[PDB]
Amino acid sequence: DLPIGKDGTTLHLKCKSDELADRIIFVGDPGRVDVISGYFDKDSIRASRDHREIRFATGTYKGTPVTVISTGMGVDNIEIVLNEIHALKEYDMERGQWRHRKGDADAPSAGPFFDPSTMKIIRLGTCGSPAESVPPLALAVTRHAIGMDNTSLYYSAGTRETSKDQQEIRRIVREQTGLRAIDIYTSMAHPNITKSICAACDAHNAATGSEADKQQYVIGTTATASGFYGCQGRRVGRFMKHLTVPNMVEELGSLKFNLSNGVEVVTNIEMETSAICYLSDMLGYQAGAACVVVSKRVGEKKMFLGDQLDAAMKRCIKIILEALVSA
Amino acid sequence: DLPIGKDGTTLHLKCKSDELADRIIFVGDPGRVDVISGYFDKDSIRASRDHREIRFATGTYKGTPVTVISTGMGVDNIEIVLNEIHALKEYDMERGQWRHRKGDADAPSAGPFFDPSTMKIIRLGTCGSPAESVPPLALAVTRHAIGMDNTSLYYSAGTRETSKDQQEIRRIVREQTGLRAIDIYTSMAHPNITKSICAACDAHNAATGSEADKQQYVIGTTATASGFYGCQGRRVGRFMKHLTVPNMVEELGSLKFNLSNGVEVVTNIEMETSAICYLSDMLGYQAGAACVVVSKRVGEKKMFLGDQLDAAMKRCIKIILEALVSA
Ligand SMILES: O=P(O)(O)O[C@H]1O[C@H](CO)[C@@H](O)[C@H]1O
Ligand SMILES: O=P(O)(O)O[C@H]1O[C@H](CO)[C@@H](O)[C@H]1O
Ligand SMILES: O=c1cc[nH]c(=O)[nH]1
Ligand SMILES: O=c1cc[nH]c(=O)[nH]1
Ligand SMILES: [Ca+2]
Numbered sequence A, B: 001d002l003p004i005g006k007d008g009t010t011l012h013l014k015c016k017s018d019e020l021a022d023r024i025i026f027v028g029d030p031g032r033v034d035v036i037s038g039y040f041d042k043d044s045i046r047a048s049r050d051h052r053e054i055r056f057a058t059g060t061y062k063g064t065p066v067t068v069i070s071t072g073m074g075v076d077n078i079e080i081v082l083n084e085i086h087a088l089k090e091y092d093m094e095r096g097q098w099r100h101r102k103g104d105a106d107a108p109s110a111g112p113f114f115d116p117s118t119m120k121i122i123r124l125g126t127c128g129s130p131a132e133s134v135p136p137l138a139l140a141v142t143r144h145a146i147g148m149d150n151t152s153l154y155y156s157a158g159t160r161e162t163s164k165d166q167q168e169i170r171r172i173v174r175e176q177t178g179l180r181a182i183d184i185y186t187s188m189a190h191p192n193i194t195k196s197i198c199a200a201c202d203a204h205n206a207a208t209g210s211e212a213d214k215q216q217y218v219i220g221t222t223a224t225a226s227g228f229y230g231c232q233g234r235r236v237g238r239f240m241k242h243l244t245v246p247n248m249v250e251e252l253g254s255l256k257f258n259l260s261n262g263v264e265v266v267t268n269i270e271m272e273t274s275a276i277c278y279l280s281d282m283l284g285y286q287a288g289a290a291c292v293v294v295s296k297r298v299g300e301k302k303m304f305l306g307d308q309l310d311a312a313m314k315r316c317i318k319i320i321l322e323a324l325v326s327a
Helices: A032-037 A075-090 A151-155 A164-176 A191-206 A237-242 A248-254 A273-283 A307-326 B032-037 B075-090 B151-155 B164-176 B191-206 B237-242 B248-253 B273-283 B307-326
Strands: A023-027 A047-051 A054-061 A064-070 A120-129 A139-147 A185-188 A217-224 A257-259 A262-264 A266-270 A286-296 B023-027 B047-051 B054-061 B064-070 B120-129 B139-147 B185-188 B217-224 B257-259 B262-264 B266-270 B286-296
Touching: A023 A032, A023 A075, A023 A307, A032 A054, A032 A064, A032 A307, A054 A307, A064 A307, A075 A151, A075 A273, A075 B075, A075 B237, A120 A191, A120 A273, A120 A307, A139 A164, A139 A191, A139 A266, A139 A273, A139 A307, A151 A185, A151 A273, A164 A185, A164 A248, A164 A257, A185 A273, A191 A217, A191 A286, A191 A307, A217 A273, A217 A286, A237 B075, A237 B273, A248 A266, A266 A286, A273 A286, A273 B237, A286 A307, B023 B032, B023 B075, B023 B307, B032 B054, B032 B064, B032 B307, B054 B307, B064 B307, B075 B151, B075 B273, B120 B191, B120 B273, B120 B307, B139 B164, B139 B191, B139 B266, B139 B273, B139 B307, B151 B185, B151 B273, B164 B185, B164 B257, B185 B273, B191 B217, B191 B286, B191 B307, B217 B262, B217 B273, B217 B286, B248 B266, B266 B286, B273 B286, B286 B307
Parallel strands: A023 A064, A023 A120, A120 A286, A139 A217, A217 A266, B023 B064, B023 B120, B120 B286, B139 B217, B217 B266
Antiparallel strands: A047 A054, A054 A064, A120 A266, A139 A185, A139 A286, A257 A262, B047 B054, B054 B064, B120 B266, B139 B185, B139 B286, B257 B262
16 A cells, blocks of 8 residues: 555655655656755755656755655656655654544544644646736746546545635536536645745845846646646647547636636646645645746747746746745 | 657657657656666667656667657656657658548548558556456556546547447446546557567467566456556555545456456556557557556555566566567
């Protein structure tokens, strides 16, 4: 059920309990781990290991412990890494038992108790945007999420009650897009994470009088896919006539969600966020996501890679580290 | 929709058309690429590049061109790599168009025509088995496939007609397991691939009298998951109470499919094979899978990693190379 090495490491993420911080940045690309850890406090990296697509490094930022982990691509990879983080934080290997939480029936009244709210997890990724308004290389910050994948369906996502706002998102997506064919699920980033990210963006821009060092951002719904091409409505060769949702981008882009705190739109599409939000919330860990827009699927109809991306990612790394330690 | 750089490479797989063989081995673990390429003919490796979890090397095996590609984990990763292989093989950059196939309405009478059956793609992976009879470190060779993931739902898998045998598998899975809650799909490895793999196993075993060097194998149905833990029925900490299919292993292990070529059982569980089979068949490419059983989920209830795995994987690499060039 949960393979643990003789060295106390989990199976994919080769990290031991005492090497993992409560505050974690997820990146998809293993290459981004070294870029991020370079921003950690000088000589603070105390643990690091690489295996498959899964790399980590743990240091400090402004004195607060932080771990950066590459997950590789997809919600399936997320499911792996979050299960292993769960075991590293809450399975006491020394005693061979799961840690108590407040409210456990047969726990001693003294505990000790593990507080899941101490876990803060933020994805810093890349993404596409179906929104005409959203600029190239903007930071798209997740509030709600649409799971077009099915990973969380194995964790009762199809039956567990959701908020009124999430019910409205699901209704609109099911009625007004080709996802009518899919048992989609929803989730939401923890409000504390979304707020922290936005505040960090604001602080960044306020701290520079150079227009070139500004970072644009947007907040909205992130749609997460179980692939990159047809799974995101890309039309490729001999596959295109077989697509279930060939007009995914335009369909998602047309949506407006009339939600409790105002109107929300689908700001971005990527491959991890839905499961990060859902599985983290299920565990009581605070999670969210922010992704640099590298593909404009409308308007510009371009990709934005290379130097421009590198510069945007440098700004966003600092913003996310700031948000993470202030959460 | 299909980004191809000026260097002629696709976005994730960093291979040029002229560097990719018609015969391909897929591995999940990027580490396995170097292990496999070491079995290529001496001084034959002519192209290689790494990016994210996606590594390749192209050489020859007994004179036939072969490429090994790591996909990383999951059907989402497969969707990426197969789309990119499709473009590299069938998008003609010099013509600015997709290659003609026989049957195309407005193709020139003489073509030329790309023959998709020239593509031979075999996954060599690791897996779990829910089958009591399947020995540890056996090679589980895919005939039929169950997609417990949803990647191929984006390619009409939920509505496209399937064979009588696949209809029966779906019926039995829905009848007798908690997967009735999921719009599961099915596929099948190409018969030529299944047969070639089995023949290579038989040839390996006939060539040695050393019992310690025999490779046991089974042929059957591979169930593919959108994760590793709850998505494969593993029970982990605070997730366990929220599983949709907590008895997945016992339920899958109990199934018998009374199919046209005889009785078939679920031999193995892993993360890539359903989409490999489904998407390749959709393209007309010949594909299949063979995975070393590293997790016995019933009976033994153990993992089989380390030197024992290394020895089995060495045998199986040679077997799959033999199968691949004979296909
Ligand atoms: O750049 P990363 O963080 O991987 O994120 C995005 O890029 C990958 C696909 O190219 C997917 O992982 C997607 O979510
Ligand atoms: O060993 P590889 O080829 O990655 O295959 C298996 O191992 C991974 C999970 O550990 C998944 O990719 C699964 O399909
Ligand atoms: O369109 C995009 C761009 C980056 N990552 C994605 O998953 N999709
Ligand atoms: O049980 C297992 C073992 C390896 N790979 C899997 O996907 N599952
Ligand atoms: Ca994946």
